[PDB]
Design a protein around this ligand. Structure first.
Ligand SMILES: [Mg+2]
Ligand SMILES: [Mg+2]
Ligand SMILES: [Mg+2]
Ligand SMILES: [Mg+2]
Ligand SMILES: [Mg+2]
Ligand SMILES: [Mg+2]
Ligand SMILES: [Mg+2]
Ligand SMILES: [Mg+2]
Ligand SMILES: [Mg+2]
Ligand SMILES: [Mg+2]
Ligand SMILES: [Mg+2]
Ligand SMILES: [Mg+2]
Ligand SMILES: [Mg+2]
Ligand SMILES: [Mg+2]
Ligand SMILES: [Mg+2]
Ligand SMILES: [Mg+2]
Ligand SMILES: [Mg+2]
Ligand SMILES: [Mg+2]
Ligand SMILES: [Mg+2]
Ligand SMILES: [Mg+2]
Ligand SMILES: [Mg+2]
Ligand SMILES: [Mg+2]
Ligand SMILES: [Mg+2]
Ligand SMILES: [Mg+2]
Ligand SMILES: [Mg+2]
Ligand SMILES: [Mg+2]
Ligand SMILES: [Mg+2]
Ligand SMILES: [Mg+2]
Ligand SMILES: [Mg+2]
Ligand SMILES: [Mg+2]
Ligand SMILES: [Mg+2]
Ligand SMILES: [Mg+2]
Ligand SMILES: [Mg+2]
Ligand SMILES: [Mg+2]
Ligand SMILES: [Mg+2]
Ligand SMILES: [Mg+2]
Ligand SMILES: [Mg+2]
Ligand SMILES: [Mg+2]
Ligand SMILES: [Mg+2]
Ligand SMILES: [Mg+2]
Ligand SMILES: [Mg+2]
Ligand SMILES: [Mg+2]
Ligand SMILES: [Mg+2]
Ligand SMILES: [Mg+2]
Ligand SMILES: [Mg+2]
Ligand SMILES: [Mg+2]
Ligand SMILES: [Mg+2]
Ligand SMILES: [Mg+2]
Ligand SMILES: [Mg+2]
Ligand SMILES: [Mg+2]
Ligand SMILES: [Mg+2]
Ligand SMILES: [Mg+2]
Ligand SMILES: [Mg+2]
Ligand SMILES: [Mg+2]
Lengths: 150, 129, 142
RNA sequence: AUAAGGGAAGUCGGCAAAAUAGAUCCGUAACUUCGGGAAAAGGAUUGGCUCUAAGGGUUGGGCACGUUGCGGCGUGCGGUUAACAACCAACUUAGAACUGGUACGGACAGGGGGAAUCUGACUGUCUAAUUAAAACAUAGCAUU
RNA sequence: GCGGGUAAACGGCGGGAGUAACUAUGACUCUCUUAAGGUAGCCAAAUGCCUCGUCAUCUAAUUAGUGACGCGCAUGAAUGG
RNA sequence: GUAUUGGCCAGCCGUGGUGACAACGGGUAACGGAGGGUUAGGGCUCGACCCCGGAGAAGGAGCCUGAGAAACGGCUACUACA
RNA sequence: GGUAAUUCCAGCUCCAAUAGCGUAUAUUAAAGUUGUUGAGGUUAAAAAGCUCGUAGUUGAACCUUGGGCCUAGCCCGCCGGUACUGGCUGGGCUGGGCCUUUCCUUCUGGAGAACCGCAUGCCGGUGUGUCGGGGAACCAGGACUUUUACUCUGAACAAAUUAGAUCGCUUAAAGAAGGCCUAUGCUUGAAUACAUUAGCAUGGAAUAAUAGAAUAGGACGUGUGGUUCUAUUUUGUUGGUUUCUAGGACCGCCGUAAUGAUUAAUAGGGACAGUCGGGGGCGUCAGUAUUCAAUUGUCAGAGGUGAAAUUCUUGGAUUUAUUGAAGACUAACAACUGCGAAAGCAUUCGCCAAGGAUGUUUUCAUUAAUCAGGAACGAAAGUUAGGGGAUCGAAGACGAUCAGAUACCGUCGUAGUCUUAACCAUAAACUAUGCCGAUUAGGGAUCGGACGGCGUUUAUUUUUGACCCGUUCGGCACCUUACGAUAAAUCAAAAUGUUUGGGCUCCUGGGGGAGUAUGGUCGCAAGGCUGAAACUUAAAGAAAUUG
RNA sequence: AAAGUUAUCCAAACUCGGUCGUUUAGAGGAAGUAAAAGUCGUAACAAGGUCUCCGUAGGUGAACCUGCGGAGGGAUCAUUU
């Protein structure tokens, strides 16, 4: 099922069979990218630019409209984040939970939880290191990890 | 996790045939599966098959008409010389007159009977009778 | 069921095998060689000894008899064991200090029949043979 | 103070005396409150003379112009001497050859050790002028 | 005076007869007796008269030493084991 | 130095080498191999011994002659027997 | 075998092998009772209490297929004639060329034919060949080609042995001998395959791994600048220098090109939205009850048991009403209902972090499954230091029953039962049933999210909230049925297993001795983990039938 | 060119001490198995006359008893406004 559970949910999204824009879209690929770059500099992580553009006006899938992937666009325009967003958010969650635990000494379950979060951090960092996005000498030290997020 | 789509396909076919069905569902499709089906057809053991092509992996629908006894898969792909290839036919085939053991070699996959005429050996992938 | 099945997993199967083999009684008996160490016979078939006295032992509950065993002194290591005398009437022939020859019952380290705690039988006395003397094929030397 | 051979056979009792002793290098048990026991037990070297090696300090680094009488400066701008040259200064450590009536911490100075039992946990204190101990005190524990 | 509590308060914590297919012992049982009848432990020990107790070890020889045995004249739990 | 390479040995300078993918050590009633016994197939067990290779002449060391020996139906010395 | 012995000691008769037969020990089959092929793990011996995680094992799909042709070789079938030949658009079978956007790298040298033609021979070409327009095929040499695994064919490799061909030592076990008319002679054999691990070459290119262009540091050009190095022979000889030239390394400018990025797995990770629960931690609020205490009224009994007594009582017991204090616990609601990895979790409210499921035309793109050692958690009881100490109650003291009663019954009662800071790591820790993945039959309930619909109820009222009908996802469960499985009880898994192979981890082999002795390791201790041997025995054990 | 001689090297052999492995004696203490017509009780198998079993702690001549938390392998698959 999932890495740490026995649940078997299947909630997800289904990609339509068609790979062509609808006839009512009438939006060129060139203009959208600059809107993407302004929102990226405005602060949104690549995750929610798609949902905000989808909700606000028109484009549901950026790939079919422009022929290029969203992160690829940001990388080619020099706006890619230094650290991947999923690992960034996982670190932020782990630091905030540790911050709660040192204040609440006898919060007995969160000690068990921290092992799961840190083990997933180590597995994802090992993948990123073995693929080359992060330098091979990068290490996750719990003491100063709070500075990386903010 | 899924470790043998071929094993899943043959198991589902064997179950449906034992249950008297006429059509079967195979979720994953691969080159080994598709090349397996014509080999099945050339001896009359199955009928028409259709593979609908969704963009993910495709599916398989083969049509059965009875006439099929069993179809199994050997999971560890052993290495067999040419001289002892008759040991396997002695092991897991009811008789030499009918039944086929399928091998994979550098010249495509084929049954053990045409493989003997090709004077070639390789790895074992399944059997049917 | 449940064994490793991979194509390069022969190491787990052979290494796991030896420990499991110890669970066999015959294997343990051979491997520790207690017969070479603990058994009265030094892993051999026969042995020679000297009789010291004749003792009678009563059988278990359903039967009722005296089995007429004998005490023997081993030359090899000087320990004391008890042995049986087969056929009938052999006790008269077998005197004290008679240089007997012994063998086993074939029960492989456990008691045989109704005779308790005795594992050996006399084959020869003064090197002539019991059954031959019983059938008067030979005469016991003095 | 010294004594041939024996080495506690003397005596209530090894009382008195003798034996070991510095430094460098090896090696070190049972037990344990894991801090110890431990310098455990038990071994090897130590002179004279002639040499070798190691451990430091101080002063010096290119052009391009302008004042002051070959020099102190004021500057601007390059390179890190593949670390060079001179002078100065006490001791500590390691190694080699030769040498002797085989001796060398040559005087002085300088732990005998091991296997067990009784008793008090330890350091400490008292009958000045016959008893320093198992006696007293101690931290800890409990009660009013 | 009468009636309750209190032992890390002072202190205390027993005798006699029978009984298992040899012999020995007594698991077991009757009996007198009051505040309770020495539990866990330990021992010829600095505490035992009979005593130089009995067995083993150390010695050529040991009233000495050590390890065990326990109806202990008269061991024993903060008078602490 | 050896018939010759080589930490085989003598000096100087670095701090290395093997290991859970089983190192290191303890047992072996262990000379190794060609091979013997037993069979549907897969295996289990034996192999001092007629063929090939290695080591030894009671236990250790040292050496002459000779192309070839650290030899024992060659020598020297100790230990135990005689 | 205890007085008519089918089983002992004898006589008759009979049985098995036969110049051989019995006994002891070792070893193999028997043994699918060691099990890769091929063995059990709900109850017969056996799934670690639970989760994370390292070695180790296993890992989703995707890249040149097909067509049209033509012909060679090689078998086999058939038909007949005749020893035996042709034929059959016979069946193939192995290819070897083609074109389809694909076909096949490359240099030099040797060698050297074919095709057309010639002179002479002849009757339009040839043997001439000491033909030239030649240039199939071969040989000997240079330059490049992802690398492993895998398979086919070769080379090299011991005599003996095994299988195995030949020869009548009178046959045979053996042996490599012998044979032929008549010979003063001739002739032959003394074979062959396998071993099988590692190493050396060749063809095939499926299956299983690996590398390549993304900050272009990418491919090409006889395009053109360079800036570096080398040096054949040619100018008489030698030396020195230069030019052109040939080749090698590196860096620019321009041009050429379809200029370089696979899907988005009912695999996984992350984001977002409305929700859901007795999941966790801290603080706070409430509830009766129990015990104790105070005030108030009366008078002889009150407790408990099959039945009594111990105990409390006019020094007013028990009971009645009001008030106060202390600690523990949250009835009914409460269920074949919910949450958590398990152990476990129920009074109100506030704060803090965490989680599942649903919805989604958000995001990354194999990031994954099980794990030897290793690590976190782990009921109750127990241990070390403080606080608290209502109720029960190990130990203990009394009252009864009984022949005895150190118990069951009744009145008291210490540790403990609560909490703070640290240890212990075992339970029938049970679903006696390991984890991941695929398929297999009908039904109706039910908890959470989403979607559709006819109506009722109701409000500063509509949409929302409550009820009803149908579909779907994810759970805790249940009834019938067997095509299936088991020795059976029984099972939608305990099925898809003699027609036996999806991936991963652990444990058992007749009963006792024994979870014992000893060694090691953790802990203050109690104890935990690992874990034998001597000896003894023919039965223990499981499910069901009749009593 | 012989005996003898000085200094290294290769080194048998002996003495003392340390360590590893095997066999074996030992007062006394404490277990297991078998053979019994032994003594004392009756814990378990029926609701075995107090339902049985598991973990933990204490107590008693002995089987055993009691406290706390679990399990049914139980003597209940089940009780409605
Ligand atoms: Mg996992
Ligand atoms: Mg799923
Ligand atoms: Mg003297
Ligand atoms: Mg003297
Ligand atoms: Mg002396
Ligand atoms: Mg004396
Ligand atoms: Mg005297
Ligand atoms: Mg003195
Ligand atoms: Mg010393
Ligand atoms: Mg000492
Ligand atoms: Mg000197
Ligand atoms: Mg000295
Ligand atoms: Mg003592
Ligand atoms: Mg003192
Ligand atoms: Mg004084
Ligand atoms: Mg004094
Ligand atoms: Mg006593
Ligand atoms: Mg005494
Ligand atoms: Mg005394
Ligand atoms: Mg004593
Ligand atoms: Mg004495
Ligand atoms: Mg003396
Ligand atoms: Mg007294
Ligand atoms: Mg006293
Ligand atoms: Mg006293
Ligand atoms: Mg290393
Ligand atoms: Mg040997
Ligand atoms: Mg041999
Ligand atoms: Mg030989
Ligand atoms: Mg020799
Ligand atoms: Mg020699
Ligand atoms: Mg000789
Ligand atoms: Mg010789
Ligand atoms: Mg079995
Ligand atoms: Mg059972
Ligand atoms: Mg069982
Ligand atoms: Mg279990
Ligand atoms: Mg695959
Ligand atoms: Mg009143
Ligand atoms: Mg409530
Ligand atoms: Mg609820
Ligand atoms: Mg483990
Ligand atoms: Mg607890
Ligand atoms: Mg307390
Ligand atoms: Mg009671
Ligand atoms: Mg009470
Ligand atoms: Mg507690
Ligand atoms: Mg357990
Ligand atoms: Mg479990
Ligand atoms: Mg609705
Ligand atoms: Mg039964
Ligand atoms: Mg004894
Ligand atoms: Mg009972
Ligand atoms: Mg039952």
């Amino acid at each position: 099922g999932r890495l740490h559970s026995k649940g078997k949910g299947i909630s997800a999204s289904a990609i339509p069979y068609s790979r062509n824009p609808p006839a009512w879209l009438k939006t060129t690929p060139e203009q959208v990218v600059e809107q993407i770059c302004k929102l990226a500099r405005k602060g949104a992580t690549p995750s929610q630019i798609g949902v905000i553009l989808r909700d606000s006006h028109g484009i549901a899938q950026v790939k079919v409209v422009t022929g290029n992937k969203i992160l690829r666009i940001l990388k080619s325009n020099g706006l890619a984040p230094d650290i991947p967003e999923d690992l960034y958010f996982l670190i932020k969650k782990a630091v905030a939970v540790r911050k709660h635990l040192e204040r609440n000494r006898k919060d007995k379950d969160s000690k068990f939880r921290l092992i799961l979060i840190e083990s997933r951090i180590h597995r994802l960092a090992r993948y990123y290191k073995t693929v080359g996005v992060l330098p091979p000498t990068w290490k996750y030290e719990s003491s100063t990890a709070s500075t990386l997020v903010a | 996790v899924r470790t043998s789509v071929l094993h899943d396909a043959l198991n589902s076919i064997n179950n449906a045939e034992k249950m008297g069905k006429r059509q079967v569902m195979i979720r994953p499709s691969s080159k080994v599966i598709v090349k397996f089906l014509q080999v099945m057809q050339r001896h009359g053991y199955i009928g028409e098959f259709e593979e609908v092509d969704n963009h993910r992996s495709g599916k398989i629908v083969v049509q059965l008409n009875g006439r099929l006894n069993k179809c199994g898969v050997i999971s560890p792909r052993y290495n067999v010389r040419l001289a002892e290839l008759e040991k396997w036919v002695t092991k897991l085939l009811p008789a030499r007159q009918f039944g086929y053991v399928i091998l994979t070699t550098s010249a495509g996959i084929m049954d053990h009977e045409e493989a003997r005429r090709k004077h070639v050996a390789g790895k074992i992938i399944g059997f049917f009778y | 069921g449940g064994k490793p099945r991979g194509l390069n997993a022969a190491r787990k199967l052979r290494n796991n095998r030896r420990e499991q083999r110890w669970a066999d009684l015959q294997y343990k008996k051979r491997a520790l060689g207690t017969a070479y160490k603990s058994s009265p016979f030094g892993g051999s078939s026969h042995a020679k000894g000297i009789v010291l006295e004749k003792v009678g032992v009563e059988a278990k509950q359903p039967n009722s008899a005296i089995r007429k065993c004998v005490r023997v002194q081993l030359i090899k290591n000087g320990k004391k064991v008890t042995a049986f005398v087969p056929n009938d009437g052999c006790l008269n022939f077998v005197d004290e200090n008679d240089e007997v020859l012994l063998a086993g019952f074939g029960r492989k380290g456990k008691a045989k029949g109704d005779i308790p705690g005795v594992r050996f039988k006399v084959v020869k006395v003064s090197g002539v043979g019991l059954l031959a003397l019983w059938k008067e094929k030979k005469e016991k030397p003095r």
